């Protein structure tokens, strides 16, 4: 779809809040590939996602997968902290013929076989063993791999996203000192040239920087999640309102500067979804009811006028 590409930013922003520069960079690289300006035998895009934990990296990879390939299922997550022990290559691409687990294939290769159109997410690439890192280079160069079975795995329709906890303490200092996004991107690059040779970094479409989320941005994520929960309740014809306090209650608990907004899912589950379920099962919240949710001395409270 043409205008899907032409309006990819607002499309990715349907699910991902803030990180405009990150989304612009991503959207621009997909457009160059789709216009036919880059190598047809390389992947669609290769990115290095930098910044703090839980600020929209996975959610961007998911949204990109849903937007371009119809579903979030078209995202493959390979955590490199599990592939650092040298015997890891056979886990990624398969055990050799005659060895236990040859018929199983490899974690990455089998996933990209049954989903040639997929977004691939590599977590903490610095941790990966040099031999695992060489396989990553082969994807970036050849646009293809050969697994242990000898079957060629195509990567030309994939979008490669690499993440790194490396360089994030610098970008935090960058925003503290008030540097523009431009020079933050340029300063982190020098930190990266100390852990990766420019051989690798030049193959990347963009070096992408994610910021910490502001108070306003956290609210917008809460709203988006309440929007999905609202759809589920609408099937029972149940309306749900939250007071500003109730929205701030969830925002305060669902975000911390260490894990980002990762706690939010189970905060919403523990503080809103589990209590609401109880009220529904008891009979206090019925089909056709409009619920107002407010803050009390113990937690969120539910009332039906
Ligand atoms: C089924 N999933 C959920 C259900 C309820 C609440 C959150 C989630 C969930 O996956 O929530 C995810 C998405 C959400 N989030 C963080 N930053 C942003 C942002 N800038 N824009 C939009 N969302 C963001 O916070 C959670 C963690 O973020 P992440 O992007 O998965 O982590 P990381 O940035 O480390 O990859």
Residue numbers in the entry: 545 to 849
Passage from the reporting paper:
The molecular chaperone ClpB, the bacterial homologue of Hsp104, is a disaggregation machine that provides thermotolerance by resolubilizing and reactivating aggregated proteins in concert with the DnaK (Hsp70) chaperone system. ClpB belongs to the family of AAA+ proteins (ATPases associated with various cellular activities) that comprises a wide range of molecular machines which utilize the energy from ATP hydrolysis to remodel their respective substrates. The AAA+ disaggregation machines Hsp104 and ClpB possess two NBDs per monomer, thus forming double-ring structures with 12 potential ATPase sites in the active hexameric complex. We determined high-resolution X-ray structures in different nucleotide states for one of the motor subunits, namely NBD2, of ClpB and combined the structural analysis with nucleotide-binding kinetics studies.
